[PDB]
C-alpha cells in the first residue's frame, strides 16, 4: 500500500535522504530510522530511547522522547501524517 506523507513528515523523510513523494510504510520506517540515526537523537547509553524534544520530529510525535520498545506514539503519528493513496 502506497502512502503520501503530509508536508511536515515529508520534510523529515527528505532530510533523511528520501527522493520519493509516495512511499510504502516500510520505506517511511526506513527513513525515520535514518533520520534518528543521522541526527543522533537516540540516547547514547540506552539506545532504544529517542530524544526528540527541540527537533521537528518531536513536534510531529507530540512527545519529548519515546522508546523504540513502546512505539505507539510513532504509530499514532504515522496515522495522523500518512494519507493512503
Amino acid at each position: 500500500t502506497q502512502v503520501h506523507p503530509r508536508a511536515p513528515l515529508l520534510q523529515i523523510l527528505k532530510v533523511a535522504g528520501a527522493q520519493e513523494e509516495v512511499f510504502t510504510v516500510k520505506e517511511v520506517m526506513h527513513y525515520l530510522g535514518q533520520y534518528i540515526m543521522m541526527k543522533q537523537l537516540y540516547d547514547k547509553q540506552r539506545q532504544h530511547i529517542v530524544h526528540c524534544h527541540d527537533d521537528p520530529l518531536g513536534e510531529l510525535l507530540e512527545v519529548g522522547s519515546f522508546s523504540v520498545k513502546n512505539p505507539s506514539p510513532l504509530y499514532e503519528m504515522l496515522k495522523r501524517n500518512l494519507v493512503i493513496l
Binding site: V25, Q47, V68, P71
Partner: peptide
C-alpha cells in the same frame, strides 16, 4: 544494543 539493531526489530 545499538539503535540500528533495535530499530530493525520494530513491527511495521
Amino acid at each position: 544494543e545499538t539503535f540500528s539493531d533495535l530499530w530493525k526489530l520494530l513491527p511495521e
